Design an enzyme around this catalytic site. Structure first.
Site, mmCIF file in Angstrom:
data_model
loop_
_atom_site.group_PDB
_atom_site.id
_atom_site.type_symbol
_atom_site.label_atom_id
_atom_site.label_comp_id
_atom_site.label_asym_id
_atom_site.label_seq_id
_atom_site.Cartn_x
_atom_site.Cartn_y
_atom_site.Cartn_z
ATOM 1 N N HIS A 242 0.801 -1.230 0.000
ATOM 2 C CA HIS A 242 0.000 0.000 0.000
ATOM 3 C C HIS A 242 0.834 1.281 0.000
ATOM 4 O O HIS A 242 0.281 2.360 -0.274
ATOM 5 C CB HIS A 242 -0.946 0.083 1.199
ATOM 6 C CG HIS A 242 -2.043 -0.930 1.194
ATOM 7 N ND1 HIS A 242 -2.859 -1.138 0.105
ATOM 8 C CD2 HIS A 242 -2.487 -1.766 2.161
ATOM 9 C CE1 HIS A 242 -3.751 -2.068 0.394
ATOM 10 N NE2 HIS A 242 -3.545 -2.467 1.636
ATOM 11 N N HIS B 189 -6.065 -7.274 -0.997
ATOM 12 C CA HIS B 189 -6.317 -5.839 -1.129
ATOM 13 C C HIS B 189 -5.482 -5.291 -2.288
ATOM 14 O O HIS B 189 -4.463 -5.882 -2.691
ATOM 15 C CB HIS B 189 -6.011 -5.122 0.187
ATOM 16 C CG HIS B 189 -6.688 -5.746 1.372
ATOM 17 N ND1 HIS B 189 -6.034 -6.592 2.248
ATOM 18 C CD2 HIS B 189 -7.965 -5.661 1.815
ATOM 19 C CE1 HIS B 189 -6.879 -6.992 3.183
ATOM 20 N NE2 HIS B 189 -8.057 -6.446 2.940
HETATM 21 O O1 LIG Z 1 -3.765 -6.509 4.382
HETATM 22 C C1 LIG Z 1 -3.790 -5.296 4.228
HETATM 23 C C2 LIG Z 1 -4.503 -4.290 5.127
HETATM 24 C C3 LIG Z 1 -5.842 -3.785 4.603
HETATM 25 C C4 LIG Z 1 -6.614 -2.897 5.592
HETATM 26 C C5 LIG Z 1 -5.858 -1.699 6.186
HETATM 27 C C6 LIG Z 1 -6.790 -0.622 6.752
HETATM 28 C C7 LIG Z 1 -6.045 0.598 7.298
HETATM 29 C C8 LIG Z 1 -7.051 1.711 7.534
HETATM 30 O O2 LIG Z 1 -8.002 1.543 8.289
HETATM 31 N N1 LIG Z 1 -6.836 2.850 6.873
HETATM 32 C C9 LIG Z 1 -7.665 3.925 6.927
HETATM 33 C C10 LIG Z 1 -9.055 3.788 6.822
HETATM 34 C C11 LIG Z 1 -9.882 4.915 6.872
HETATM 35 C C12 LIG Z 1 -9.309 6.180 7.030
HETATM 36 C C13 LIG Z 1 -7.922 6.317 7.134
HETATM 37 C C14 LIG Z 1 -7.105 5.190 7.082
HETATM 38 N N2 LIG Z 1 -3.115 -4.803 3.258
HETATM 39 O O3 LIG Z 1 -3.223 -5.473 2.036
HETATM 40 K K LIG Z 2 -3.467 -7.496 -4.522
HETATM 41 ZN ZN LIG Z 3 -3.910 -7.223 2.340
#
Ligand SMILES: O=C(CCCCCCC(=O)Nc1ccccc1)NO
Ligand SMILES: [K+]
Ligand SMILES: [Zn+2]
Ligand SMILES: [K+]
EC number: 3.5.1.-
Length: 367
Positions: free
Chosen positions: A142, A181
């Site tokens: 990410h 994701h």
């Molecule tokens: O496995 C994963 C993690 C996926 C989920 C991560 C969520 C992080 C989060 O809650 N971010 C966020 C949400 C709303 C507002 C600001 C940040 N990566 O692939």
């Molecule tokens: K992926």
């Molecule tokens: Zn993930």
């Protein structure tokens, strides 16, 4: 000869006392021992690699801390600087998104996570190892050029890919990301760059929101070298293998990478809390087998797995083990959830799954 990276500190990542966000009295989010992303899930995968005897078939590879130079191949100077800043704070703190945290000196673990990917990559490319798995933490996919996001401090696979490009002189690298994701960070980094083909399979709009549509194809000289394969919730082994057979493998063969890096998350598993997919350990086993065989065909077997997400401490270890077994060719332990999960479905390619995949096939033309 199969390389394997685990560092003790991967299991020491401090995920605080909340569930996702921090605990919060006003919101009445009660503290809990295990955050969704608690390092125990990945530690249990490591311990299973050892307890199952797989470790006897692996060559342990020590992580090396990624250098500033290493990081700046994938990330902005501003981002590195910012991570240094946050890591140097007395308590550490928020890396930018209100959710992704790094403790004081947490940069150390971030550097070791990316550096685990780099070291394995280096040794596979020299020909010392045939392939390997870097069981790193924190994850990477990410984190875009100029930020941390979604538990990711640095984009480990992108740092590795960058190293393979600049230091090892490879012309083309492919990153295949099957974490459930969207790999928005990886997509961002190589957006304008045809020298790294970026592929992501993901539950559509699972995370981030408004990200991972198939219309996201790169730009300039990099147009046609980002492939998103968004899949519907409830997709299982049949959908995943169809996507591999119809898009992923054709894509890799068209592109002719010198190295395949797999962003290997297991959060598509049947029991994961953070997605709605139905992939079983056998599904991941088939996915790994196809991708390793592909590497054998097209780039002298040069394949490097790098851990991304996965949140079932119960089941992730067996999903991971199955991939390790495909690397070692020693298959010595059953998935003890196999019959329990098999009955649940996911093993029939549904019309809506077939259509989502069909939507991407025309993009192969532009590789
Ligand atoms: O496995 C994963 C993690 C996926 C989920 C991560 C969520 C992080 C989060 O809650 N971010 C966020 C949400 C709303 C507002 C600001 C940040 N990566 O692939
Ligand atoms: K992926
Ligand atoms: Zn993930
Ligand atoms: K690209």
């Amino acid at each position: 000869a199969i390389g394997y990276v685990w560092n003790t500190l991967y299991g020491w990542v401090d995920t605080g006392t909340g569930s996702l966000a921090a605990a919060n009295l006003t919101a009445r989010m009660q503290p809990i021992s295990h955050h969704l992303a608690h390092p125990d899930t990945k530690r249990r995968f490591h311990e299973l690699v050892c307890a199952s005897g797989q470790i006897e078939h692996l060559t342990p590879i020590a992580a090396v801390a990624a250098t500033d130079a290493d990081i700046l191949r994938a990330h902005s100077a501003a981002h590195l600087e910012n991570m240094k800043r946050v890591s140097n704070l007395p308590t550490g703190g928020d890396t930018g998104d209100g959710i992704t945290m790094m403790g004081n000196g947490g940069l150390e673990i971030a550097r070791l996570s990316a550096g685990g990917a780099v070291e394995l990559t280096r040794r596979v490319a020299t020909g010392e190892l045939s392939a390997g798995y870097a069981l790193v933490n924190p994850p990477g996919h990410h984190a875009p050029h100029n930020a941390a996001m979604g538990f990711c401090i640095f984009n480990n696979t992108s740092v590795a890919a960058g190293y393979a490009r600049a230091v090892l002189g490879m012309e083309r690298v492919a990153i295949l990301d099957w974490d459930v994701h969207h790999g928005n960070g990886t997509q961002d980094i190589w957006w304008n760059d045809p020298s790294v083909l970026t592929i992501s399979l993901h539950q559509h709009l699972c995370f981030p929101p408004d990200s991972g549509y198939s219309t996201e194809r790169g730009a300039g000289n990099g147009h046609g070298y980002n492939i998103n394969v968004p899949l519907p919730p409830g997709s299982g082994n049949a959908a995943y293998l169809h996507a591999m057979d119809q898009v992923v493998l054709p894509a890799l063969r068209a592109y002719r990478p010198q190295l395949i890096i797999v962003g290997s998350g297991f959060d598509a598993s049947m029991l994961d809390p953070l997605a709605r997919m139905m992939v079983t350990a056998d599904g991941f086993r088939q996915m790994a087998r196809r991708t390793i065989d592909c590497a054998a065909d097209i780039c002298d077997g040069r394949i490097v797995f790098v851990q991304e997400g996965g949140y079932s401490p119960h089941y992730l270890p067996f999903c991971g083990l199955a991939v390790i077994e495909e690397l070692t060719g020693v298959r010595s332990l059953p998935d003890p959830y196999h019959e329990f999960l098999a009955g649940m479905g996911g093993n029939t390619l549904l019309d809506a799954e077939r259509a989502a995949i069909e939507e991407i096939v025309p993009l192969l033309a532009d590789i």
